Amino acid sequence: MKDTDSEEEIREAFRVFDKDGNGYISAAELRHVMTNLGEKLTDEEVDEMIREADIDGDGQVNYEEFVQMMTAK
């Protein structure tokens, strides 16, 4: 669509922790977020699914790498 207009609902459901921090949050942050935004699973499916987003590129799980969970293609 345009740059990244799909991270609107994501950054919102994830900014609760990295709102003004850096976008990249810890796994414990995702387990609580991915477990409620449009998604909703368990601290095991999320902590074991973060290996897909957060891995070492830069910050743990930022929005650019967080949308991969709510829509990993």
Side-chain angles (χ1 to χ4, degrees):
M1 240 221 285
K2 50 230 284 254
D3 168 58
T4 358
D5 186 63
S6 178
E7 327 196 66
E8 103 174 54
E9 204 217 311
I10 290 90
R11 106 79 201 288
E12 167 71 48
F14 216 39
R15 66 145 24 201
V16 176
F17 300 94
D18 247 24
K19 26 145 183 205
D20 185 72
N22 278 304
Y24 89 76
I25 17 186
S26 295
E29 262 67 287
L30 230 123
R31 44 94 135 229
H32 179 118
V33 201
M34 240 224 304
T35 294
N36 68 46
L37 22 43
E39 298 69 56
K40 47 127 148 182
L41 52 162
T42 70
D43 188 274
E44 296 213 85
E45 300 244 23
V46 51
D47 210 334
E48 210 198 11
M49 178 68 52
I50 248 122
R51 312 207 294 198
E52 185 78 73
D54 173 26
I55 45 119
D56 39 67
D58 271 279
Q60 284 307 274
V61 225
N62 65 98
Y63 298 179
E64 326 208 70
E65 277 282 23
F66 183 36
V67 44
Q68 174 131 240
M69 319 260 96
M70 39 242 49
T71 186
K73 59 236 133 213

